[PDB]
């Protein structure tokens, strides 16, 4: 369920992420900056259907943020890429956590799964796909 996602995560690898950020409309400074980040996540949950994610994106953007949501309930988001009017919703599909953002008539999706102990996110904006993986801290 949601329990398996809980706790701290640190980035392990990233592919095509700047290109994804450009595709969702981020300015070049932020897409190139975002591509270089090494984020840390702190995930917490309540009741198996509420989550809070605190993110330290890290250098070179140095943006910290958080999202808080209930599964199935749309919420407003103000992401680092500066898109306006973003409406987000998160739901489970099997063992995967699927996060959809809608803004300006467009949609983008993040699919999150645990694979051999790593948190793997696949990001899709139209034909542009990216992937990032996170690991647990050893201490
Ligand atoms: C299991 C549930 C789960 C959730 C809900 C989750 C959410 C999540 N993951 C990230 C990293 C993070 N950061 C960014 C984007 C940026 N980073 C930068 O420093 C800049 C400038 C940009 C934009 C230009 C994205 C698109 C993501 C989502 C992909 C990821 O999780 O790595 C953020 C920060 C997004 C932002 O800064 O706007 C959020 C809310 N991660 C999880 O593992």
PDB file of C-alpha atoms and ligand atoms in Angstrom:
ATOM      1  CA  UNK A   1       0.000   0.000   0.000  1.00  0.00           C
ATOM      2  CA  UNK A   2       1.350   3.445   0.952  1.00  0.00           C
ATOM      3  CA  UNK A   3       3.285   2.119   3.963  1.00  0.00           C
ATOM      4  CA  UNK A   4       6.151   0.784   1.817  1.00  0.00           C
ATOM      5  CA  UNK A   5       6.981   4.298   0.556  1.00  0.00           C
ATOM      6  CA  UNK A   6       7.451   5.763   4.038  1.00  0.00           C
ATOM      7  CA  UNK A   7      10.714   7.201   5.277  1.00  0.00           C
ATOM      8  CA  UNK A   8      13.791   8.780   3.787  1.00  0.00           C
ATOM      9  CA  UNK A   9      15.039   8.394   0.201  1.00  0.00           C
ATOM     10  CA  UNK A  10      18.109   9.778  -1.628  1.00  0.00           C
ATOM     11  CA  UNK A  11      18.594   9.966  -5.380  1.00  0.00           C
ATOM     12  CA  UNK A  12      20.555   7.205  -7.052  1.00  0.00           C
ATOM     13  CA  UNK A  13      20.161   7.936 -10.804  1.00  0.00           C
ATOM     14  CA  UNK A  14      18.313  10.141 -13.283  1.00  0.00           C
ATOM     15  CA  UNK A  15      17.799   9.975 -17.075  1.00  0.00           C
ATOM     16  CA  UNK A  16      16.269  12.471 -19.460  1.00  0.00           C
ATOM     17  CA  UNK A  17      15.018  14.608 -16.562  1.00  0.00           C
ATOM     18  CA  UNK A  18      15.962  18.015 -17.943  1.00  0.00           C
ATOM     19  CA  UNK A  19      14.224  17.139 -21.201  1.00  0.00           C
ATOM     20  CA  UNK A  20      11.084  16.214 -19.215  1.00  0.00           C
ATOM     21  CA  UNK A  21      11.287  19.518 -17.336  1.00  0.00           C
ATOM     22  CA  UNK A  22      11.551  21.413 -20.646  1.00  0.00           C
ATOM     23  CA  UNK A  23       8.523  19.489 -21.951  1.00  0.00           C
ATOM     24  CA  UNK A  24       6.333  20.603 -18.997  1.00  0.00           C
ATOM     25  CA  UNK A  25       7.383  24.214 -19.633  1.00  0.00           C
ATOM     26  CA  UNK A  26      10.184  24.895 -17.147  1.00  0.00           C
ATOM     27  CA  UNK A  27      12.582  27.663 -18.152  1.00  0.00           C
ATOM     28  CA  UNK A  28      16.000  26.504 -19.385  1.00  0.00           C
ATOM     29  CA  UNK A  29      17.792  27.626 -16.200  1.00  0.00           C
ATOM     30  CA  UNK A  30      15.473  25.464 -14.089  1.00  0.00           C
ATOM     31  CA  UNK A  31      15.357  22.490 -16.431  1.00  0.00           C
ATOM     32  CA  UNK A  32      19.152  22.358 -16.604  1.00  0.00           C
ATOM     33  CA  UNK A  33      19.356  23.063 -12.862  1.00  0.00           C
ATOM     34  CA  UNK A  34      16.740  20.419 -12.107  1.00  0.00           C
ATOM     35  CA  UNK A  35      18.592  17.872 -14.199  1.00  0.00           C
ATOM     36  CA  UNK A  36      21.657  18.334 -11.965  1.00  0.00           C
ATOM     37  CA  UNK A  37      19.852  18.063  -8.626  1.00  0.00           C
ATOM     38  CA  UNK A  38      20.407  15.303  -6.093  1.00  0.00           C
ATOM     39  CA  UNK A  39      17.124  15.372  -4.125  1.00  0.00           C
ATOM     40  CA  UNK A  40      16.287  13.857  -0.741  1.00  0.00           C
ATOM     41  CA  UNK A  41      12.692  12.880   0.108  1.00  0.00           C
ATOM     42  CA  UNK A  42      11.070  12.421   3.510  1.00  0.00           C
ATOM     43  CA  UNK A  43       7.821  10.562   3.123  1.00  0.00           C
ATOM     44  CA  UNK A  44       5.282  10.146   5.903  1.00  0.00           C
ATOM     45  CA  UNK A  45       1.740   8.763   5.929  1.00  0.00           C
ATOM     46  CA  UNK A  46      -1.438   8.626   7.898  1.00  0.00           C
ATOM     47  CA  UNK A  47      -4.169   5.962   7.731  1.00  0.00           C
ATOM     48  CA  UNK A  48      -2.931   4.340   4.525  1.00  0.00           C
ATOM     49  CA  UNK A  49      -4.548   7.094   2.449  1.00  0.00           C
ATOM     50  CA  UNK A  50      -2.855  10.374   3.478  1.00  0.00           C
ATOM     51  CA  UNK A  51       0.746  11.320   2.702  1.00  0.00           C
ATOM     52  CA  UNK A  52       3.181  14.143   3.219  1.00  0.00           C
ATOM     53  CA  UNK A  53       6.338  14.390   1.139  1.00  0.00           C
ATOM     54  CA  UNK A  54       9.047  16.874   2.088  1.00  0.00           C
ATOM     55  CA  UNK A  55      11.669  17.440  -0.615  1.00  0.00           C
ATOM     56  CA  UNK A  56      15.089  19.027  -0.476  1.00  0.00           C
ATOM     57  CA  UNK A  57      15.899  19.313  -4.193  1.00  0.00           C
ATOM     58  CA  UNK A  58      19.438  20.388  -3.302  1.00  0.00           C
ATOM     59  CA  UNK A  59      22.080  22.153  -5.410  1.00  0.00           C
ATOM     60  CA  UNK A  60      22.078  23.806  -7.831  1.00  0.00           C
ATOM     61  CA  UNK A  61      18.482  25.001  -7.446  1.00  0.00           C
ATOM     62  CA  UNK A  62      18.330  24.852  -3.628  1.00  0.00           C
ATOM     63  CA  UNK A  63      14.540  24.570  -3.570  1.00  0.00           C
ATOM     64  CA  UNK A  64      12.831  22.839  -0.640  1.00  0.00           C
ATOM     65  CA  UNK A  65       9.113  22.138  -0.817  1.00  0.00           C
ATOM     66  CA  UNK A  66       6.396  19.781   0.340  1.00  0.00           C
ATOM     67  CA  UNK A  67       3.162  18.264  -0.818  1.00  0.00           C
ATOM     68  CA  UNK A  68       0.359  16.938   1.390  1.00  0.00           C
ATOM     69  CA  UNK A  69      -2.558  14.963  -0.014  1.00  0.00           C
ATOM     70  CA  UNK A  70      -5.264  12.399   0.498  1.00  0.00           C
ATOM     71  CA  UNK A  71      -5.502   9.609  -2.095  1.00  0.00           C
ATOM     72  CA  UNK A  72      -8.181  10.380  -4.642  1.00  0.00           C
ATOM     73  CA  UNK A  73      -8.577  14.017  -3.591  1.00  0.00           C
ATOM     74  CA  UNK A  74      -7.514  16.748  -5.996  1.00  0.00           C
ATOM     75  CA  UNK A  75      -5.292  19.470  -4.557  1.00  0.00           C
ATOM     76  CA  UNK A  76      -3.558  22.664  -5.658  1.00  0.00           C
ATOM     77  CA  UNK A  77       0.187  22.460  -6.302  1.00  0.00           C
ATOM     78  CA  UNK A  78       2.747  25.222  -6.881  1.00  0.00           C
ATOM     79  CA  UNK A  79       5.717  23.343  -8.324  1.00  0.00           C
ATOM     80  CA  UNK A  80       9.309  24.535  -8.718  1.00  0.00           C
ATOM     81  CA  UNK A  81       8.930  24.660 -12.482  1.00  0.00           C
ATOM     82  CA  UNK A  82       6.572  27.619 -11.927  1.00  0.00           C
ATOM     83  CA  UNK A  83       3.536  26.279 -13.817  1.00  0.00           C
ATOM     84  CA  UNK A  84       0.309  28.045 -12.921  1.00  0.00           C
ATOM     85  CA  UNK A  85      -3.011  26.514 -12.122  1.00  0.00           C
ATOM     86  CA  UNK A  86      -1.720  23.042 -11.382  1.00  0.00           C
ATOM     87  CA  UNK A  87      -4.292  20.610 -10.032  1.00  0.00           C
ATOM     88  CA  UNK A  88      -2.856  17.331  -8.781  1.00  0.00           C
ATOM     89  CA  UNK A  89      -4.281  13.988  -7.701  1.00  0.00           C
ATOM     90  CA  UNK A  90      -2.696  10.792  -6.452  1.00  0.00           C
ATOM     91  CA  UNK A  91      -4.133   7.261  -6.554  1.00  0.00           C
ATOM     92  CA  UNK A  92      -3.000   3.668  -6.298  1.00  0.00           C
ATOM     93  CA  UNK A  93      -3.058   1.268  -9.287  1.00  0.00           C
ATOM     94  CA  UNK A  94      -2.103  -2.109  -7.854  1.00  0.00           C
ATOM     95  CA  UNK A  95       1.232  -1.587  -6.038  1.00  0.00           C
ATOM     96  CA  UNK A  96       2.037   1.602  -7.946  1.00  0.00           C
ATOM     97  CA  UNK A  97       1.397   5.176  -6.824  1.00  0.00           C
ATOM     98  CA  UNK A  98       0.249   7.291  -9.734  1.00  0.00           C
ATOM     99  CA  UNK A  99       0.382  11.086  -9.593  1.00  0.00           C
ATOM    100  CA  UNK A 100      -1.301  13.223 -12.266  1.00  0.00           C
ATOM    101  CA  UNK A 101      -0.972  16.978 -12.735  1.00  0.00           C
ATOM    102  CA  UNK A 102      -3.346  18.992 -14.918  1.00  0.00           C
ATOM    103  CA  UNK A 103      -2.769  22.600 -15.952  1.00  0.00           C
ATOM    104  CA  UNK A 104      -3.610  24.752 -18.955  1.00  0.00           C
ATOM    105  CA  UNK A 105      -5.408  21.834 -20.639  1.00  0.00           C
ATOM    106  CA  UNK A 106      -2.280  19.655 -20.411  1.00  0.00           C
ATOM    107  CA  UNK A 107      -1.561  16.579 -18.243  1.00  0.00           C
ATOM    108  CA  UNK A 108       1.594  14.888 -17.017  1.00  0.00           C
ATOM    109  CA  UNK A 109       1.991  11.664 -15.025  1.00  0.00           C
ATOM    110  CA  UNK A 110       4.448  10.224 -12.496  1.00  0.00           C
ATOM    111  CA  UNK A 111       4.335   6.477 -11.759  1.00  0.00           C
ATOM    112  CA  UNK A 112       6.156   5.395  -8.600  1.00  0.00           C
ATOM    113  CA  UNK A 113       7.038   1.837  -7.617  1.00  0.00           C
ATOM    114  CA  UNK A 114       9.515   0.036  -5.385  1.00  0.00           C
ATOM    115  CA  UNK A 115      11.906  -2.211  -7.324  1.00  0.00           C
ATOM    116  CA  UNK A 116      14.652  -4.129  -5.485  1.00  0.00           C
ATOM    117  CA  UNK A 117      14.397  -1.731  -2.621  1.00  0.00           C
ATOM    118  CA  UNK A 118      14.667   1.388  -4.773  1.00  0.00           C
ATOM    119  CA  UNK A 119      11.955   3.961  -5.398  1.00  0.00           C
ATOM    120  CA  UNK A 120      11.601   4.296  -9.164  1.00  0.00           C
ATOM    121  CA  UNK A 121       9.659   7.164 -10.778  1.00  0.00           C
ATOM    122  CA  UNK A 122       8.710   7.214 -14.455  1.00  0.00           C
ATOM    123  CA  UNK A 123       7.708  10.652 -15.727  1.00  0.00           C
ATOM    124  CA  UNK A 124       5.682  11.164 -18.874  1.00  0.00           C
ATOM    125  CA  UNK A 125       4.775  14.351 -20.723  1.00  0.00           C
ATOM    126  CA  UNK A 126       3.381  13.463 -24.129  1.00  0.00           C
ATOM    127  CA  UNK A 127       6.145  11.614 -25.967  1.00  0.00           C
ATOM    128  CA  UNK A 128       8.868  12.692 -23.521  1.00  0.00           C
ATOM    129  CA  UNK A 129       9.693  10.167 -20.826  1.00  0.00           C
ATOM    130  CA  UNK A 130      12.198  10.392 -17.961  1.00  0.00           C
ATOM    131  CA  UNK A 131      13.140   8.187 -15.049  1.00  0.00           C
ATOM    132  CA  UNK A 132      14.658   8.728 -11.645  1.00  0.00           C
ATOM    133  CA  UNK A 133      15.565   6.182  -8.956  1.00  0.00           C
ATOM    134  CA  UNK A 134      16.118   6.687  -5.224  1.00  0.00           C
ATOM    135  CA  UNK A 135      17.807   4.502  -2.616  1.00  0.00           C
ATOM    136  CA  UNK A 136      17.564   4.276   1.168  1.00  0.00           C
ATOM    137  CA  UNK A 137      20.231   5.777   3.363  1.00  0.00           C
ATOM    138  CA  UNK A 138      22.660   3.239   4.846  1.00  0.00           C
ATOM    139  CA  UNK A 139      22.884   5.111   8.184  1.00  0.00           C
TER     140      UNK A 139
HETATM  141  C1  LIG B   1       6.110   8.220  -3.229  1.00  0.00           C
HETATM  142  C2  LIG B   1       5.572   9.461  -3.430  1.00  0.00           C
HETATM  143  C3  LIG B   1       6.340  10.645  -3.887  1.00  0.00           C
HETATM  144  C4  LIG B   1       5.900  11.831  -4.106  1.00  0.00           C
HETATM  145  C5  LIG B   1       4.466  12.299  -3.946  1.00  0.00           C
HETATM  146  C6  LIG B   1       6.936  12.696  -4.507  1.00  0.00           C
HETATM  147  C7  LIG B   1       6.842  14.026  -4.829  1.00  0.00           C
HETATM  148  C8  LIG B   1       7.901  14.957  -5.254  1.00  0.00           C
HETATM  149  N1  LIG B   1       9.133  14.644  -5.722  1.00  0.00           N
HETATM  150  C9  LIG B   1       9.803  15.796  -5.990  1.00  0.00           C
HETATM  151  C10 LIG B   1      11.170  15.821  -6.651  1.00  0.00           C
HETATM  152  C11 LIG B   1      10.975  16.407  -7.919  1.00  0.00           C
HETATM  153  N2  LIG B   1      11.567  17.649  -8.316  1.00  0.00           N
HETATM  154  C12 LIG B   1      11.117  18.059  -9.516  1.00  0.00           C
HETATM  155  C13 LIG B   1      11.421  19.274 -10.289  1.00  0.00           C
HETATM  156  C14 LIG B   1      12.344  20.221  -9.988  1.00  0.00           C
HETATM  157  N3  LIG B   1      13.319  20.067  -8.940  1.00  0.00           N
HETATM  158  C15 LIG B   1      14.150  21.361  -8.916  1.00  0.00           C
HETATM  159  O1  LIG B   1      15.069  21.599  -8.185  1.00  0.00           O
HETATM  160  C16 LIG B   1      13.519  22.113 -10.037  1.00  0.00           C
HETATM  161  C17 LIG B   1      14.003  23.485 -10.366  1.00  0.00           C
HETATM  162  C18 LIG B   1      12.553  21.455 -10.578  1.00  0.00           C
HETATM  163  C19 LIG B   1      11.684  21.919 -11.675  1.00  0.00           C
HETATM  164  C20 LIG B   1      12.141  22.658 -12.716  1.00  0.00           C
HETATM  165  C21 LIG B   1      10.171  17.028  -9.991  1.00  0.00           C
HETATM  166  C22 LIG B   1       9.471  17.118 -11.307  1.00  0.00           C
HETATM  167  C23 LIG B   1      10.104  16.036  -9.048  1.00  0.00           C
HETATM  168  C24 LIG B   1       9.231  14.813  -9.135  1.00  0.00           C
HETATM  169  C25 LIG B   1      10.041  13.613  -9.583  1.00  0.00           C
HETATM  170  C26 LIG B   1      10.747  12.989  -8.434  1.00  0.00           C
HETATM  171  O2  LIG B   1      10.120  12.519  -7.456  1.00  0.00           O
HETATM  172  O3  LIG B   1      11.987  12.896  -8.466  1.00  0.00           O
HETATM  173  C27 LIG B   1       8.991  16.875  -5.679  1.00  0.00           C
HETATM  174  C28 LIG B   1       9.359  18.321  -5.799  1.00  0.00           C
HETATM  175  C29 LIG B   1       8.770  18.971  -6.987  1.00  0.00           C
HETATM  176  C30 LIG B   1       9.099  20.416  -7.097  1.00  0.00           C
HETATM  177  O4  LIG B   1      10.145  20.893  -6.569  1.00  0.00           O
HETATM  178  O5  LIG B   1       8.246  21.148  -7.719  1.00  0.00           O
HETATM  179  C31 LIG B   1       7.785  16.341  -5.224  1.00  0.00           C
HETATM  180  C32 LIG B   1       6.585  17.111  -4.760  1.00  0.00           C
HETATM  181  N4  LIG B   1       8.137  11.956  -4.568  1.00  0.00           N
HETATM  182  C33 LIG B   1       7.829  10.523  -4.171  1.00  0.00           C
HETATM  183  O6  LIG B   1       8.622   9.648  -4.113  1.00  0.00           O
END
